[PDB]
Amino acid sequence: AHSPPGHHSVTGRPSVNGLALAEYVIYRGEQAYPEYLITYQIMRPE
Amino acid sequence: GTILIDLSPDDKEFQSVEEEMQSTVREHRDGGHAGGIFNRYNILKIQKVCNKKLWERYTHRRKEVSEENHNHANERMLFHGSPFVNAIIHKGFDERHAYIGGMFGAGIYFAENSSKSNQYVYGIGGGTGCPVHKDRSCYICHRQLLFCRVTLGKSFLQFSA
Numbered sequence: 169a170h171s172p173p174g175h176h177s178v179t180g181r182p183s184v185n186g187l188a189l190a191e192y193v194i195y196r197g198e199q200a201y202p203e204y205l206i207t208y209q210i211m212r213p214e
Numbered sequence: 215g216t217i218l219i220d221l222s223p224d225d226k227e228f229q230s231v232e233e234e235m236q237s238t239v240r241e242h243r244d245g246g247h248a249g250g251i252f253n254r255y256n257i258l259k260i261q262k263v264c265n266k267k268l269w270e271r272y273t274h275r276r277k278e279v280s281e282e283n284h285n286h287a288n289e290r291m292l293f294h295g296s297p298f299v300n301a302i303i304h305k306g307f308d309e310r311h312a313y314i315g316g317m318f319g320a321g322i323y324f325a326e327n328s329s330k331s332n333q334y335v336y337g338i339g340g341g342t343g344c345p346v347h348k349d350r351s352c353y354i355c356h357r358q359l360l361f362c363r364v365t366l367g368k369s370f371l372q373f374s375a
């Protein structure tokens with residue numbers, strides 16, 4: 169795909185969940201650089 | 215030409231990345247279906263990704279976008295989860311890492327919520343979960359996320375429900 173004309177990306181913002189944060193979309197791989205690699209486990213709630 | 219450098223848990227940089235991770239966990243509307251049920255992570259390791267070629271590739275595109283957006287790159291740090299993480303850190307992001315059926319268009323997606331990106335570590339919808347247990351909520355197997363520098367430039371605002 170291509171971004172909207174004259175735009176370099178898309179900001180998707182949830183309108184129903186005020187606690188959900190934004191998501192973003194770029195259409196050129198060169199606009200992102202994988203700065204940190206994080207290794208983790210999810211933790212079971214107590 | 216990619217090198218991974220371990221950050222120390224006693225390093226401010228490690229701690230800053232861990233806090234972004236932990237502080238952006240939220241609940242999801244699928245009740246944990248895709249990414250599992252959790253309120254926090256156990257961080258095992260944080261490595262800095264160094265590749266001179268991929269960096270200049272990024273800073274060259276950043277300059278173009280910046281000048282197109284009147285000297286404003288609009289650069290952020292954002293999370294990305296993917297089955298393709300090991301290819302990404304060595305070869306960089308490209309069309310193969312895009313989401314054809316994303317609800318904001320067929321591009322490469324990033325999240326402010328770490329738990330949102332966690333939903334994609336084992337694939338769209340969580341795939342079939344971890345390889346070993348086939349458990350999307352596995353508390354045993356190790357997962358990896360990327361925390362990325364992203365150039366947004368002039369970004370189109372789309373509201374979604």
Ligand SMILES: Cc1cccc2c(=O)[nH]c3c(c12)CO[C@@H](C(C)C)C3
Nearest residue numbers: 294295296312313323324325331334
């Ligand atoms: C859609 C979305 C929203 C927020 C974060 C993310 C994220 O962090 N990763 C991915 C997606 C995503 C969707 O595309 C997948 C690829 C493997 C197809 C990876």
Ligand SMILES: [Zn+2]
Nearest residue numbers: 344347352355
């Ligand atoms: Zn497992």
